[PDB]
Amino acid sequence: EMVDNLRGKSGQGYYVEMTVGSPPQTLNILVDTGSSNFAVGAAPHPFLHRYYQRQLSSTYRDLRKGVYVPYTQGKWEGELGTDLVSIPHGPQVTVRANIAAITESDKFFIQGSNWEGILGLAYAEIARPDDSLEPFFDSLVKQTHVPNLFSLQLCSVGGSMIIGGIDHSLYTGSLWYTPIRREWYYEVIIVRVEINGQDLKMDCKEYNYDKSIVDSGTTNLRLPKKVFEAAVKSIKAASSTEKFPDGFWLGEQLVCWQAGTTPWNIFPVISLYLMGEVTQQSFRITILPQQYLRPVEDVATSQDDCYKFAISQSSTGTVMGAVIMEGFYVVFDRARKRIGFAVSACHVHDEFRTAAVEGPFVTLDMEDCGYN
Ligand SMILES: C[C@H](NC[C@@H](O)[C@H](Cc1ccccc1)NC(=O)c1cccc(N(c2ccccc2)S(C)(=O)=O)c1)C(=O)NC1CCCCC1
Numbered sequence: 001e002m003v004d005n006l007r008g009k010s011g012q013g014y015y016v017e018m019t020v021g022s023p024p025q026t027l028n029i030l031v032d033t034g035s036s037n038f039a040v041g042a043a044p045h046p047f048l049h050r051y052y053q054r055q056l057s058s059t060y061r062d063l064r065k066g067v068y069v070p071y072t073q074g075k076w077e078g079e080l081g082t083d084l085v086s087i088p089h090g091p092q093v094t095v096r097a098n099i100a101a102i103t104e105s106d107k108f109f110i111q112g113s114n115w116e117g118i119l120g121l122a123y124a125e126i127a128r129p130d131d132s133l134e135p136f137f138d139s140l141v142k143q144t145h146v147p148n149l150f151s152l153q154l155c156s157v158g159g160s161m162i163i164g165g166i167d168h169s170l171y172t173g174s175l176w177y178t179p180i181r182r183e184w185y186y187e188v189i190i191v192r193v194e195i196n197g198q199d200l201k202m203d204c205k206e207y208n209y210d211k212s213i214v215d216s217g218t219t220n221l222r223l224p225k226k227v228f229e230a231a232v233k234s235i236k237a238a239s240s241t242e243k244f245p246d247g248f249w250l251g252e253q254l255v256c257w258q259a260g261t262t263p264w265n266i267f268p269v270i271s272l273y274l275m276g277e278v279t280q281q282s283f284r285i286t287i288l289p290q291q292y293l294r295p296v297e298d299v300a301t302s303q304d305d306c307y308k309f310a311i312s313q314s315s316t317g318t319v320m321g322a323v324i325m326e327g328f329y330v331v332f333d334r335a336r337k338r339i340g341f342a343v344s345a346c347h348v349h350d351e352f353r354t355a356a357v358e359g360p361f362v363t364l365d366m367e368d369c370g371y372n
Contacts, residue, residue, distance in 0.1 A: 002167070003167065009112070025057070027115075036123060040118075043102070045109055054083075072218065074106065097140070124138065189370055190275075202227065213320065217321075269353060277338065284356070293310065
């Protein structure tokens, strides 16, 4: 009953239905592995269809404390409290959880997104105001018998969030695991990057400067400057039969082709090798252009298919965002401090190339690829 419990619009996150309060108030909540605060619109906003009304909930408890949360995109402020929370198409349990009631925001809510709040699924270490504000998933595990694991299958769009377990119908082939380096973000280690099989040939610490994270709340694959610049050069080289404006590579401009004529084959596959569970072993996940060229739906441009380049630069480390997660089944195995990847039942592929999760690979160089 948890399969197909996510929806979304491209570039605007994936969301699950939740209820808050007594009697229950239904809200759509963005699933975010890149933060640790559960927060809901709690006052009118031009882009909110609905919001949390604390005065209607007899189970609301005010914590008499404000909270401010800034993201890489957007920010909000609100009032902390606790209330009863359910997930109608998740586990059939009700938990008392911390909730930030958003009273003011800036460039957070999105016009016509269909979500009204955000579920930070990462660890307390990055919760605001500090790590004493217990995250939702921690509360869920403590208060119920739910195993300490969830999985995401991100595929208008849809997918599944499976809480407490692994649904084998959502993937094919083998699950490969990479260790969670530190429990704050879902921090992982990239050991190697290839573009159409060609190694970028950097010290592997560069790939993880200053961390690498798995983040369902960020649209793009974001790369440290040095890595981003090297990747763009290699992708340009591979696709050099067509020349695109500089603005395209910066994500500031769309690239468009006559409907149905997108030249997928001129764009390369990107392979990210992730640290394995055994010394100097790794596995790779392979990303097709159908993943990193994000379609932008617009009826005005619909004689064409138009795309945004969804790889972008970062000054805060690698972010493996939604365009990386889509087409994989990603298991957040908190119990065993590891993240698993497998090929998803929902995958794009064309008749020539297929996204993959494969291994093992061995590396001679004994360098630790962690930045810190
Ligand atoms: C990086 C980490 N996780 C960010 C994530 O929590 C946040 C959630 C969110 C979802 C929907 C609307 C706003 C915010 N996602 C983003 O910040 C986000 C969302 C979409 C696109 C982008 N990208 C971006 C990057 C830089 C500048 C502008 C846009 S993109 C276009 O490259 O895909 C970012 C994070 O910041 N975690 C914080 C959580 C709170 C404590 C401090 C750490």
